[PDB]
Amino acid sequence: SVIKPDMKIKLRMEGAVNGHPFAIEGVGLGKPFEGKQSMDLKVKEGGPLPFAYDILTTVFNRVFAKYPENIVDYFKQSFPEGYSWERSMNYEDGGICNATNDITLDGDCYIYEIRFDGVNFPANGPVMQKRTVKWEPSTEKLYVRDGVLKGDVNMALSLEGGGHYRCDFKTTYKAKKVVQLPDYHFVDHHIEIKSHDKDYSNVNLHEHAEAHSE
């Protein structure tokens, strides 16, 4: 046991985009072995957010990915101690976000302490003009480096005017104890904002993920 079929999530994120700060909290649930999850998210400070919520959504846990038995699962093995990660998100227009998640487990509920910091998004660009629609589904590429796990992914935001806005994600995953390291593999993801109020003070977010290799 320790990884149960059904588990819960609470989180807090504190952050800032272009020096304007904000914080959001949320609760949710999901199935680790099915790679599915969902959550509700409320802006507690800095609302109404003046930039595209989509930049936050991949920051709001790779335990919720379906691993087959022939690929080692760095994430499920890491609990109950858990793990953290860091990431920079490098947008084609020179906007850059750094984020971190510290993940712990209390009973059947994961707990995330998130930091998010974005800078240099142009005023006319699609993040600050809120011209984004969704992330496309993706394939993350995961490899070992210096004893820890890396995950790189080419991501794309569909723009409401048509076309896409590209971002490169480089994530380092750090387990809090010794676990077995996997060989090169992939994680397919698909993240969707399933509902939201007008200024996104409330968001319902969904993701499903599946590992594969060879």
Applying CB under 5 A, the residues found at the interface with Co ion are 190
> Cβ 208 to Co ion, closest distance in Å?
6
Query: Considering only CA atoms, which of 57, 23, 22 is closest in space to residue 39?
Result: 57
Q: What does the block give as tokens for 7?
A: 């588990």
Binding residues: 196, 206, 208
Binding residues for Cu(2+): 196, 206, 208
Q: Which uninterrupted H or E stretch holds 41?
A: strand 36-45
> Cβ 36 to Co ion, closest distance in Å?
10
Query: Would you say 36 or 190 has its CB closer to Co ion?
Result: 190
Query: Would you say 8 or 196 has its CB closer to Co ion?
Result: 196
Measured over the CA atoms of residue 60, residue 63, residue 67 and residue 73, the dihedral's sign is positive
> Cβ 53 to Co ion, closest distance in Å?
10
> Cβ 139 to Co ion, closest distance in Å?
13
Q: Angle 120-98-167 (CA atoms, 0-180°, nearest 5)? A: 70
Name every residue whose Cβ is closer than 8 Å to that of residue 14 and which is 6 or more positions away in sequence: 21, 22, 23, 114, 115, 116
Q: Which residue is nearest to Co ion (CB)?
A: 190
Query: Would you say 84 or 204 has its CB closer to Co ion?
Result: 204
Q: What are phi and psi of 177, to 5 degrees?
A: -145, 175
Query: Would you say 190 or 212 has its CB closer to Co ion?
Result: 190
Tokens 């005023």 belong to which residue?
123
Q: Given the DSSP bridges, would you call strands 109-119 and 7-17 parallel, antiparallel or unpaired? A: parallel
> Cβ 56 to Co ion, closest distance in Å?
15
Query: Would you say 60 or 79 has its CB closer to Co ion?
Result: 60
